[PDB]
Amino acid sequence: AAHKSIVSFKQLREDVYGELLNTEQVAGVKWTRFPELNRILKGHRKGELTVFTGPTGSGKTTFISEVALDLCIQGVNTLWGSFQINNVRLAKIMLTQFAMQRLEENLEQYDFWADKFEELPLYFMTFHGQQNIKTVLDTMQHAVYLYDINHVIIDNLQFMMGQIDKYAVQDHIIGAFRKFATNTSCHVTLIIHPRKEEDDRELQTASIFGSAKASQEADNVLILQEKKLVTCPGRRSLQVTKNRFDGDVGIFPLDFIKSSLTFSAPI
Amino acid sequence: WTRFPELNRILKGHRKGELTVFTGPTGSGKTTFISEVALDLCIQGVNTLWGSFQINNVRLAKIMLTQFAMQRLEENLEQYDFWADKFEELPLYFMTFHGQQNIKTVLDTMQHAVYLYDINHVIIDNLQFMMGQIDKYAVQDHIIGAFRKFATNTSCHVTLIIHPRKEEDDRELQTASIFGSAKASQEADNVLILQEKKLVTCPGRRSLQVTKNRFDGDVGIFPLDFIKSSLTFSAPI
Amino acid sequence: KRVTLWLGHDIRSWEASKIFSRKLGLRRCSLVRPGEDRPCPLEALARGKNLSRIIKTSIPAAHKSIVSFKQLREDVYGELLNTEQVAGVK
DNA sequence: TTTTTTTTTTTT
Ligand SMILES: Nc1ncnc2c1ncn2[C@@H]1O[C@H](COP(=O)(O)OP(=O)(O)OP(=O)(O)O)[C@@H](O)[C@H]1O
Ligand SMILES: Nc1ncnc2c1ncn2[C@@H]1O[C@H](COP(=O)(O)OP(=O)(O)OP(=O)(O)O)[C@@H](O)[C@H]1O
Ligand SMILES: [Mg+2]
Ligand SMILES: [Mg+2]
């Protein structure tokens, strides 16, 4: 009675007590600019993999940038994988979102905001085109070992994966990402494009392009919705279909302030 | 844009390094409108290259010269020399290809022309004609990815004209109607799309929508009218 | 027969080389558009391999890209002349 | 044996 079959609570009781003691530490950093996400996702917890998807040109990158900027203010060290937008335009968008005002109008205040934003724990990767899973993941481990980052975002898996036996390399890379997340306790965010819909159906959790493993092994399936008008549709809606921790599903409308390029509070 | 005031308040201009896709109903005037846009852009600074994979290079040149002349040049051949000479100095180029060609040979000519003429606007007509030759729905994605990589590594505005799938002739063309995989819709920066109001005799009243706009996201439509005499798409009326 | 332009690598030289090639026999002298400097700096910078490969791989002056209304003028004029022949038998 | 993507027929 000494092999790898772990014994009962006689040695696991202490871990359970420790987890139950810090109930406010299991659910980690909360959101400041997003009161709705504080009552749905119950916060941001390390070691979980989440997938993001939405209609074409619906603002997936902009919303993720806002969430990352909100989380990076207090404690979270973030790493950005910009596989679609070059690192300068993304930097402009994030800076404009932080400044809460059109920085192009006033270049005299550029120095102050740049200095105040310079010390935040923000990191980027210079990868822009198609890359294999071996080279990108090595930089992830190297950045974890040095800067101690706890929130990595990859932009458009379909872009990086796109190069055979398709519908299988995607499963391999997403499994590698899940293994890296669980072995290191870093919140990995993935933006996976959906399959071709008919533009009049609400995007369900089964619309993820590829095998079903993406929805199976993910912990949060935050998905955007579009109400296609003829002129400036707006009124984007966000749904949370799956939630492993404290399962809760809900939606809430969002409005877009054009001046600040930020997703305002629900109205 | 100069002849298109509406496009100055929707796409906010023409920017290098972006790939745009054009689509519309069959025989609705996709080639003519693209010709007008390219001619209006090439006037000031833009050096353009044309892919005439459906229309032979003589008819396309005739249409472009008619649009530049703003009148029926066939009526007055005495004025042909003056407008031909005024049209000669414009930085315009074409490719001699007319039939099906693989992506490896057409792309090399683009690089060779970029290295010499410093062009920043290459237009490809009828991607379905170029792709038409297996594993279909995969070569199209490959060539679209190659075009996107070439555009981002060279910073030249690549315009693509892709046919839509077989519609019911009574439904507005959505952004998901692009023939092939959905890679074109996610991967392109502008999804300029034409609309048709099918009448029984000379319908007209073509409508243009902008479903996607990566830079300064704005969506809007504006009707267009066609001056038959000058073969030009006039200002919205 | 096959000349190779070796103008300066800076500005106002590559364009001058293009202009000279256009003035001279087109499709007969290939210009050089490499990232290295002139042959003297290349020899100084130990770029002999570059000076032997890039020069031998010079970009040809012409290509299968038909020109603007310097050619095709006759065909367009002809098609605009016998407009009654564009539409054939009635 | 999954997994998109276009196209014709039948029957909820
Ligand atoms: N709700 C909204 N209302 C108006 N404009 C918006 C809204 N959301 C985003 N935009 C605009 O759309 C532009 C593109 O945004 P973004 O880059 O996030 O799209 P994307 O999700 O990356 O597109 P794709 O899905 O094709 O990659 C932004 O410049 C932004 O100004
Ligand atoms: N709005 C309009 N009203 C009347 N005639 C038009 C209009 N637009 C285009 N045309 C005519 O239709 C003819 C064909 O135009 P064009 O070559 O652009 O079609 P196309 O888009 O190439 O067709 P396809 O989609 O089958 O390739 C032109 O000669 C033009 O005179
Ligand atoms: Mg994006
Ligand atoms: Mg056509």
Numbering used by the authors:
A (entry chain E): 242 to 404, 409 to 512
B (entry chain D): 272 to 404, 409 to 512
C (entry chain C): 182 to 271
From the reporting publication:
Twinkle is a mitochondrial replicative helicase which can self-load onto and unwind mitochondrial DNA. The N-terminal domain (NTD) of Twinkle is derived from the TOPPRIM family primase. The helicase domain is located on the C-terminal half of Twinkle. Similar to gp4 and DnaB, Twinkle forms a homo-hexamer and migrates in the 5′ to 3′ direction on the single-stranded DNA (ssDNA).
Thus, the purified E325Q LcTwinkle–DNA–ATP complex from gel filtration was used for cryo-EM analysis. We determined the LcTwinkle–DNA complex structure with cryo-EM at 3.5 Å resolution. LcTwinkle forms a homo-hexamer wrapping DNA in its central channel. The CTDs form a non-planar lock-washer-shaped hexamer, similar to gp4 and DnaB. The NTDs are attached to the side of the CTDs. An extended linker connects the NTD and the CTD (N–C linker) in a domain-swapped manner. ATPase sites are located at each of the subunit interfaces, and five ATP molecules can be refined. A 12 nt ssDNA binds to the central channel of LcTwinkle, with an average of 2 nt per subunit. The almost identical configurations of the ATP-binding sites in the LcTwinkle hexamer suggested that all subunits have a similar chance of hydrolyzing ATP. The domain-swapped interface is a hotspot for disease-related mutations.
